[PDB]
Design a protein around this ligand. Sequence first.
Ligand SMILES: OC[C@H]1O[C@@H](O)[C@@H](O)[C@@H](O)[C@@H]1O
Ligand SMILES: OC[C@H]1O[C@@H](O)[C@@H](O)[C@@H](O)[C@@H]1O
Ligand SMILES: [Mn+2]
Ligand SMILES: [Mn+2]
Lengths: 178, 178
Amino acid sequence: HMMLTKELVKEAREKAIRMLEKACIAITDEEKEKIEVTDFGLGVLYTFGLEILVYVNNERYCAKELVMFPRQICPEHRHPPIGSYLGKQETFRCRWGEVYLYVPGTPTPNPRARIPEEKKRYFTVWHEIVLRPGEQYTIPPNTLHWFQAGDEGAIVSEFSSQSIDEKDIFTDPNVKRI
Amino acid sequence: HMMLTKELVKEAREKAIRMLEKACIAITDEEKEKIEVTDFGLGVLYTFGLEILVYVNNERYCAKELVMFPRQICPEHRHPPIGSYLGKQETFRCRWGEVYLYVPGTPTPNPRARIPEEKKRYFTVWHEIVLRPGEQYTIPPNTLHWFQAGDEGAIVSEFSSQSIDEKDIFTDPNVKRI
Ligand SMILES: OC[C@H]1O[C@@H](O)[C@@H](O)[C@@H](O)[C@@H]1O
Ligand SMILES: OC[C@H]1O[C@@H](O)[C@@H](O)[C@@H](O)[C@@H]1O
Ligand SMILES: [Mn+2]
Ligand SMILES: [Mn+2]
């Protein structure tokens, strides 16, 4: 249950690099140094965390590679409207492994995800979309969602409207995105 | 110098599938059937052509995979403003192979591309950007550009504002996009 040190960040960045290269996704040396490692401020990176390569992000489009270690969870959040921006719409495409995405709707029986008991209160949507390599789903703006990688981890691509991560809203009050 | 038949389209679609899978890019069966094969209406697909998988294309963002056979050329074009749309801005990322992209600016000496004599009149920009796997370049709207794959072909990803291919403007008057 540790604060996010320089050394933990390095270890996670190197692991995400290994995963990307094993999936045959080429990345430049400059990109290797720029991969973002977030524990969402929750201090258990291998439980709640994401390792992110931003390919491009501007007002007109965004694309990222979201690397997830085995059973890593992205905590529940929504990309809200901000001023006259509608909020981010995103399409996820699983490239490698598998991911369990949860969105609003009828609760899926026998969900695949496993959430710590202490954190169950912070997952409110339970309609399951399982994505395997090549499969996609689109999330409209201001929609609560979260995801957990399967037992071998996942690489999930994002194609989206502009990303403004600083303005995301997280169900878990403990989360600090940056 | 042949019209684009059902059989030529099938052959090219299958070759693009082989290339995608060799590059470890997963694609679904439905996507395999939906890959677009265009000879730009010029009747020499292996000289001028593109094989395209659209991942997603809506008013807020677009992402595609552009598959190019060895030395296949995308003829020169620009994505213009249309009404109050600025025109498409796109970022290209080479995933596999290599591609020679040409944009406006100072002519690059010793360009890598090889253009048929009959078609040289239709390439007006000659500032070369070579992209190898992992490398990117961004093209602003209404900018003339064209590209040729290297000797082993290329897979180039596009991340872009919405795509409206029907409205592209091509230097070569012979081109019919669809
Ligand atoms: O903000 C947390 C993360 O949420 C995921 O769903 C994606 O939207 C990422 O782009 C983002 O960085
Ligand atoms: O229209 C021809 C093609 O031009 C390429 O540069 C890309 O912009 C493709 O998306 C497009 O289909
Ligand atoms: Mn999201
Ligand atoms: Mn273009």
